[PDB]
């Protein structure tokens, strides 16, 4: 709930307004994981927020 972050495994570039662009290695908080495929994430590394593909991250 505040104890866990995820790490980005790969680079991803969004061309949609609601997806997050991020680089591998970024530290991400998962904000909304109600859906299995796409999670709302907040990057602590960039301060940006948006949906990410769930298979692009793993728990840190
Ligand atoms: Ni927590």
Residue numbers in the entry: 81 to 140
What's written in the study?
The non-receptor c-Src tyrosine kinase participates in different signaling processes by phosphorylation of tyrosine residues in a variety of proteins, modifying their properties, such as enzymatic activity, subcellular localization and stability. The c-Src tyrosine kinase is made up of six functional regions: (i) a N-terminal fatty acid-acylation domain, (ii) a unique domain, (iii) a Src homology 3 (SH3) domain, (iv) a Src homology 2 (SH2) domain, (v) a catalytic domain, and (vi) a C-terminal regulatory domain. Of all those, the SH3 domain plays a key role in the regulation of the tyrosine kinase activity through the recognition of an intramolecular Proline Rich Motif (PRM) and, additionally, through the interaction with other PRMs present in other proteins. To better understand the mechanism of 3D-domain swapping formation in c-Src-SH3 domain, and its plausible implication in amyloid fibril formation, we have solved the crystallographic structures of the WT and three mutants at position 128 of the c-Src-SH3 domain.
The structures of the monomeric form of the WT (WTM) and Gln128Glu mutant (Q128EM) of the c-Src-SH3 domain were solved from crystals belonging to space group P212121 with two molecules in the AU. In both structures, whereas chain A could be completely modeled (amino acids 81-140), some residues at the n-Src loop of chain B could not be modeled because of the lack of electron-density in the difference maps. Residues belonging to this cloning tail participate in the binding of a Ni2+ ion through their backbone nitrogen atoms and the Nδ1 atom of His83 side-chain. In both structures, the main differences between chains A and B are located at the distal and n-Src loops. In both monomeric structures, the side-chain of residue Glu106 in chain A (Glu106A) is hydrogen-bonded to Ser123A side-chain and two water molecules, thereafter W1 and W2. A third water molecule, W3, is placed at hydrogen-bond distance of Gln128A side-chain (or Glu128A in the Gln128Glu mutant), the carbonyl atom of Ser101A and W2. However, in chain B, Glu106B side-chain is hydrogen-bonded to Thr125B side-chain (2.8 Å) instead of Ser123B side-chain (distance between Glu106B and Ser123B is 5 Å). Gln128B (or Glu128B) side-chain is oriented outwards from the pocket formed between the diverging β-turn and the distal loop, and therefore, its interaction with W3 is lost. Changes at the folding nucleation site also affect residue Leu100, which is conserved among SH3 domains, and is part of the hydrophobic core with an ASA value <10 Å2. This residue shows different rotamers at each chain: rotamer tp in chain A vs rotamer mt in chain B. The presence of the rotamer mt is allowed by the displacement of the backbone of the distal loop (distance between A and B chain backbone atoms was ∼1.5 Å) and the low steric hindrance of the nearby residue, Gly130.
